[PDB]
């Protein structure tokens, strides 16, 4: 849901911002909700690494819409280039992250 925002119109500022702020609020309430299951251990589990990486991805898609909106009206070419790039970069890095994660935690 945070990655769909890239494909939204570049002029629709109000929509992409709601996307970012929500996807972050949701990830926070879900990082406290899922955390509400385990006892109070002093180390980081595997689910907590997955949640941290997802939270990172979300905040990168946000930081990326913010960068595009700060570069638009000045260099729209640079904005178009970074948007057309992120639209591919993000999915492949999240796919390889899922592959690595499940491979390293299902073999033990």
């Amino acid at each position: 849901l945070s990655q769909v925002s890239f494909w939204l119109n570049r002029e629709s500022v109000p929509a992409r911002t709601v996307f970012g702020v929500t996807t972050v609020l949701t990830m926070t309430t879900l990082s406290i909700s899922a955390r509400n299951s385990l006892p109070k251990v002093a180390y980081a589990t595997a689910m907590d690494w997955f949640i941290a990486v997802c939270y990172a991805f979300v905040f990168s898609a946000l930081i990326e819409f913010a960068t595009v909106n700060y570069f638009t009206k000045s260099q729209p070419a640079r904005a178009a280039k970074i948007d057309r790039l992120s639209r591919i970069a993000f999915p492949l890095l999240f796919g390889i992250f899922n592959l690595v994660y499940w491979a390293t935690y299902l073999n033990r």
């Binding site: 500022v13 109000p14 911002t17 709601v18 970012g20 702020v21 929500t22 972050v24 609020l25 926070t28 990082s31 406290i32 955390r35 006892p39 109070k40 251990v41 002093a42 180390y43 980081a44 907590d48 939270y55 905040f59 946000l62 913010a66 909106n69 700060y70």
Partner: protein, 104 residues
């Protein structure tokens, strides 16, 4: 309870190896830092009774809280800071940011 200090005498056996198994205690949150054995004679209105005290010192680990309650607030503040890079003409976006942040 019943016997005053002129009828019974409490003392740790060994006086330092009396209490064992403290360095093997693994707590999920705290962590035993030190333990002490004391010997006193308390005074109540019915006499003076012997007393031993076994005292621990538990230091709380901060990993769980850094994980659970500090990081979400810190990152919510970071998100709130985004409202400055948006152009000041956007009236809904910035408001959304600040209000969601406050409520959260």
């Amino acid at each position: 309870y019943g016997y005053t200090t002129d009828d019974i005498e409490f003392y740790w056996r060994g006086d330092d190896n009396a209490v064992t198994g403290v360095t093997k205690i693994e707590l999920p949150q705290f962590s035993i830092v030190d333990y002490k054995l004391i010997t006193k004679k308390v005074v109540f209105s019915t006499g003076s009774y012997p007393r031993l005290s076994l005292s621990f010192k538990l230091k709380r680990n901060i990993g769980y809280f850094i994980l659970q309650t500090y990081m979400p607030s810190i990152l919510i503040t970071i998100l709130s800071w985004v409202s400055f890079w948006i152009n000041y003409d956007a009236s809904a976006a910035r408001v959304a940011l600040g209000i969601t942040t406050v409520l959260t």
